[PDB]
Amino acid sequence: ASLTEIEHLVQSVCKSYRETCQLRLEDLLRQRSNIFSREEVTGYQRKSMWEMWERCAHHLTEAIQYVVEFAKRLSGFMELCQNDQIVLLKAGAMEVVLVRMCRAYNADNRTVFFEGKYGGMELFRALGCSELISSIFDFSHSLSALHFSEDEIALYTALVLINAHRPGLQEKRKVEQLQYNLELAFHHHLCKTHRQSILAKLPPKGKLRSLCSQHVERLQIFQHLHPIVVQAAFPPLYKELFS
Template sequence: MADGRGTGGWLVRASALIPAGALFAGSSPTPSEGTDQDKVQQAADSNSPKQPFVPCKVCGDRASGYHYGVTSCEGCKGFFRRSIQKQIDYRCLRDGKCMVIRLNRNRCQYCRFKKCLAVGMSRDSVRYGRVPKRSKSLEDHSVSSTDSATSSQDQLALENKQLAIYDVILSISQAHHSHCAITEDKIKNIVRQPATLMSKIHIPPGQIQFSNEELEVQRLLMWQQLATLVTPAINSVVEFSKRVPNFSDLSQDDQLVLIKLGFFEIWLTRMARMIDREENVMVFEDGSCISREELAVVYSPDFVTSMFEVCNGFNMLNLNDTEIGLFTAIVLATADRQGLSDTSAVERIQDSLVEALTLQVSRNHSTEENLFAAVLMKLPELRTLGSQHNDLLRWYRLQWHRGNLPPLFAEIYDIPKNQAAETPSQS
């Protein structure tokens, strides 16, 4: 197996930072209204100095009631509603670490939105209305003026942890939307067109079928055409990887190992939505529809059958774009890839991503108790396909001198570049 180091580390060296992508897509039920909430509402609306001051959990201003599951002011209530309904994209110029208080709450919308999510505001409650309320004891604990110093510290630590998790979720969501051509919105604009990997080769007059040599040439030509279709995704995966929190802190060699050895698994996860089982085709980001039969020639019938089955199973999980982004980031941060030097650092990255996906799934799919376990079960399935894919590449690696592959594709799979050849030999 290739160790992922290769030459030409420009895979990870090149690129300027790209502005954050799409808005965080996903959170779900938290508290709504009730008797205790009405009391807080009355206290917040009252002008009487005898009424207790109930702070907004987002900015600390006077709360006007329970909005989208959280004690909050009118300003934060309206801000959160607009952010969700208009699907606004935000950016932070200070690494997502701005303090959000009443006096500066309008200064950084990214951090204000992150704080809304972290304290429990529910995206689904904006879209669908009221949601189940939190237990009275938990709300009483959060607004009680008699909390002990220890409890306050615990609450602060919990809030900081939640903020850190939501920072990961937002970062991955924006990176995925910016650097994946196969998101829910982008798929709508893909225009399908029939395509083929087959290339015409010369057949001597009177010859009825291909010789073994001609079949090998045809297979190599088809693989080259497939490589051309896959290559745009390589740059997307590289750019996405560099925006995974703490990934860039790894050594360049370790970054290359993770990107190279994880690319096929990440690519296939993204492409799962593009498998059309009815027409038996895979649709690429440029709209090219390649038949299952042609893919089976490039790889093998059994391998392509496994590909389609794994993709179909993944689609049945009904994950949204943010969840797919988090899952592919987990695939990227696999600590037992051959050739890694700092496995502990990679494990820490993956642990934070798993925690983020756990929260994201639990909030978005609160009624599907076993969904997170089902998602994680896809990891070994992909790993098996990745190993089989690497085995299939061995034959192509031996034929490197007969073809000319796109440079990125050749580097991602550690295939020597044959700069002298333009096409595989047809003699």
């Protein structure tokens, strides 16, 4: 409740994000010419549905683990009760990764960083969920048009996580208070940097929810086809969040 306090929250959030961002932006940018060839692409398409699902679930889990660490270092998160921490992470971890993903997306040729190189949505054809894949690509394309700075991603992803509307919260008002302070920090930073134009261009929450629902739906379809693969070869954290 003072400029100095809000500004302190902005830097805290930005720091917490930097420490848990998984890959540095520069590293991702340096690799943009490193693109899968036609032969490697064909190689991905020839892989079994279940091998590809397993690999995607593994990489999603790695990314989620960084988001979990982000939350632990996020001012006020650990002071919430354990029930609410779990509720917020279960609902928001995937949404945060989806936002973070625009950093690894190349709008100029419509590719994303995956297993050491950049590839287009055709790389994922073996998954058998083309609607989900192109929606994530489209979502990433829309976020790329905003030209997020890292600090903006830090602040926005903090708010994606700290959402007082999540069902199952026991200390709703306490999450409301933290949410409000992070909104002030985000919006103060946007005001300071003359970037409040992006507020109206941020995707609605229903878009993020739609992507997460589709992901869960397509997992369910896949798990019905290969139940022992999920039981035997999917990461436990993934199954906990999504099964």
